[PDB]
Amino acid sequence: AVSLDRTRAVFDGSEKSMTLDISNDNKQLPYLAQAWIENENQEKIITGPVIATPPVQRLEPGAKSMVRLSTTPDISKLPQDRESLFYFNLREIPPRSEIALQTKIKLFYRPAAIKTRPNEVWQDQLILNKVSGGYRIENPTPYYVTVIGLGGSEKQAEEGEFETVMLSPRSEQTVKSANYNTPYLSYINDYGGRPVLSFICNGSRCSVKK
């Protein structure tokens, strides 16, 4: 019943806070909406460096509210040349009645030093190294990157079976996979869209098509 305007959020470090819209899709019953932040190991944190306000609210049937995300000053202590990962959580509690689902989204703190132009695509810096078993995927960027498909074609990338892998900033991860002549890679962007990247290889090192 209680849902969210997006599948992931990017807190731009220039801002002091942002806001997420929430909705009660039930048009008969009211829900309470609990909201909280967790850190990158998914342990709840209530003192900062990011907080969600209000911790709880009531939504009348059909209602559209909001949750405010803000930073304490110890936000300054996070590294300023890479994203840090948080998760935003939202739980609906049904009335006295007489499962209760919970949404979880990745919340990327993005320091002002690595802010981006709207639409510009850092994901095109991902590099693929053929290894035995499949591929090593390298992320030299300061951003987390979330890979959802891999394949010989665009369709096989979007529709094939694939265990999602979030590559940390300036990191790398190895992935079982068949060998493809031209690799296509599916990823999730800031807006939650899921585009694809075409790759061309030169022996064992594939790079995004330019």
Residues whose CB falls within 8 Å of the CB of residue 42, separated by 6 or more in sequence, listed in order = 87
**Co-location of 30 and 110 in the same domain:** yes
How many other CB atoms are found less than 10 A from the CB of residue 26? 17
**Co-location of 129 and 180 in the same domain:** yes
Pairing mode of beta strands 171-176, 205-208: unpaired
**Co-location of 47 and 150 in the same domain:** no
Distance CA 9, CA 20 (A): 9
**Co-location of 92 and 153 in the same domain:** no
**Co-location of 73 and 146 in the same domain:** no
In which domain, by residue range, is 161 found?
Answer: 116-206
- CATH assignment of the domain containing 69: 2.60.40.10
**Among 63, 93, 115, which residue terminates a domain?**
115
The closest of 138, 121, 117 to 210, measured between CA atoms, is: 121
Contact 45, 88 (CB under 8 A): no
In order of 20, 37, 48, 73, 205, the CA distances from 78 in angstroms are 22, 16, 12, 10, 33
Chain-centre distance of CA 127, in angstroms? Answer: 20
**Co-location of 57 and 140 in the same domain:** no
* Resolution of the experimental structure, in angstroms: 2.7
Contact 182, 152 (CB under 8 A): yes
Q: Read off the tokens for 190.
A: 């800031």
Three-class SS of the chain: CEEECCCEEEEECCCCEEEEEEEECCCCCCEEEEEEEECCCCCEECCCCEEEECCEEEECCCCEEEEEEEECHHHHHCCCCCCEEEEEEEEEECCCCCCCCEEEEEEEEECHHHCCCCCCCHHHHCEEEEECCEEEEEECCCCCEEEEEEECCHHHHHHCCCCCEEECCCEEEEEECCCCCCCEEEEECCCCCCCEEEEEECCCEEEECC
Number of residues that make up the chain: 210
Q: Read off the tokens for 197.
A: 């990247």
HSE of 126 in the Cβ direction (CA atoms, 13 Å)?
A: 28
Contact 68, 17 (CB under 8 A): yes
How many other CB atoms are found less than 10 A from the CB of residue 33? 24
Q: Read off the tokens for 174.
A: 């190895």
Across 143-181, b (16+ Cβ under 10 Å) vs e yields bbbbbbbbbebbeebbebebeeeebebeeeeebebeebe
Distance CA 18, CA 175 (A): 35
**Co-location of 10 and 93 in the same domain:** yes
The reply to whether omega before 195 is within 30° of 0 (cis) is no
In order of 39, 43, 193, the CA distances from 36 in angstroms are 10, 10, 25
Distance CA 89, CA 38 (A): 8
Contact 38, 52 (CB under 8 A): no
Across 73-82, b (16+ Cβ under 10 Å) vs e yields eebeeeeeeb
The closest of 174, 182, 175, 179 to 198, measured between CA atoms, is: 182
Number of domains in the chain: 2
